[PDB]
Write a protein that binds this ligand. Structure first.
Ligand SMILES: [N-]=[N+]=NC[C@H]1O[C@@H](n2c(SCCC(=O)O)nc3c(N)ncnc32)[C@H](O)[C@@H]1O
Length: 341
């Protein structure tokens, strides 16, 4: 088998002329030439079978991406693995080759307002479809937003996704490890398991802020720091918003803090479009029940040049609703059979 960086990257003969791209959350990512479609593609090598949690996340990603079909969500074009469960050690996921991602782009490129608007529209368009499937992405962040050379944007990595479960969202204070720290909504640290759609909107708000300045808006240095950053900008929650938190440990923590004034968005972002800042404010709303939902965000005046609900499709088949790694390997093997061979 062809090799890259000293490890097996076994994708031939259909895929040749491999180039190392990077180390992902799952393993090695390479580009390759697709001798059938006559185009270069991305290939991700995944080696999950020793660990139940890796098997979980891999099965999640495959099951969701195979059912979804949307312009702003990365597809799976092919899946390579051994013909038998016994011989299956790795799984390769073949996807459209994308020039960059928003994390890499923000490291060196200033975005025009037109690009910010276009990117945000595409994020919300993809998110509308995800949420219409009753699915939460739960790890939206710049590095999970792929971009091709013409700035078409695709949401990727559904390994942490879940079916929404609002009736079971409540929990205690300082539990819960949802999303990537900087993109984590304030209620995750207070009383939420991140089982409602508002968790994703918070992350999109954080992404919008980061597009406006090329800096993360809430750069918490560790888990506990993250709420400090959020409150340092939003200021102290109102009595009404505190009255919505019944958990006493969470509420009394907030009551124990000195008063903090809100920092006006236009002082943080003096060059930003005022309509973008109005939408930003509605996505970065402290109370998740008052936070804007994805279809309202699409209809916001900032996005008026793109908004078209008839061209913002929803899922045909929402997802309606412990396993040892052996059963998970068998499930991964079954889920990938359609690509044999
Ligand atoms: N990651 N990583 N590894 C490093 C490189 O992986 C690049 N990348 C991924 S990564 C998917 C998410 C993950 O697997 O974490 N998908 C693609 C892709 N379809 N086309 C081009 N490049 C891709 C990413 O920009 C990063 O530069």
């Amino acid at each position: 088998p062809e090799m890259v960086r000293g490890q097996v990257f076994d994708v031939g003969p259909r895929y040749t002329n491999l180039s190392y791209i990077g180390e992902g959350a799952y393993g090695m990512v390479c580009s390759a030439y697709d001798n059938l479609n006559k185009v270069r593609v991305a290939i991700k090598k995944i080696s999950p079978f020793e660990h139940q949690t890796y098997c979980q996340r891999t099965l999640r990603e495959i099951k969701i991406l195979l059912r979804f079909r949307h312009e702003n969500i990365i597809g799976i074009n092919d899946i390579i693995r051994a013909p038998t469960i016994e011989q299956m050690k790795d799984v390769y996921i073949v996807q459209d080759l994308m020039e960059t991602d928003l994390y890499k782009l923000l490291k060196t490129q200033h975005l025009s307002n037109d690009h910010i608007c276009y990117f945000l529209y595409q994020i919300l368009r993809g998110l509308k479809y995800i949420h219409s499937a009753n699915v939460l992405h739960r790890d939206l962040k710049p590095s999970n937003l792929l971009l091709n050379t013409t700035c078409d944007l695709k949401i990727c990595d559904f390994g942490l996704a879940r079916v929404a479960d609002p009736d079971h969202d409540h929990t205690g204070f300082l539990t819960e490890y949802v999303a990537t720290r900087w993109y984590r909504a304030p209620e995750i640290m207070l009383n939420s398991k991140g089982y409602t759609k508002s968790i994703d909107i918070w992350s999109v708000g954080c992404i919008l802020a980061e597009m406006l300045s090329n800096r993360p808006i809430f750069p918490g240095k560790h888990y506990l720091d993250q709420l400090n950053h959020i409150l340092g900008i939003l200021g102290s929650p109102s009595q009404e918003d505190l009255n919505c938190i019944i958990n006493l440990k969470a509420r009394n923590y907030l009551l124990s803090l000195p008063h903090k004034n809100k920092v006006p968005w236009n002082r943080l972002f003096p060059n930003a479009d005022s309509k973008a800042l109005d939408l930003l404010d509605k996505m970065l709303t402290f109370n998740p029940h008052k936070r804007i939902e994805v279809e309202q965000a699409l209809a916001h005046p900032y996005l008026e040049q793109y908004y078209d609900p008839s061209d913002e499709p929803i899922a045909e088949a929402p997802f309606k609703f412990d396993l040892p790694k052996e059963k998970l390997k068998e499930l991964i093997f079954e889920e990938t059979a359609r690509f044999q061979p």
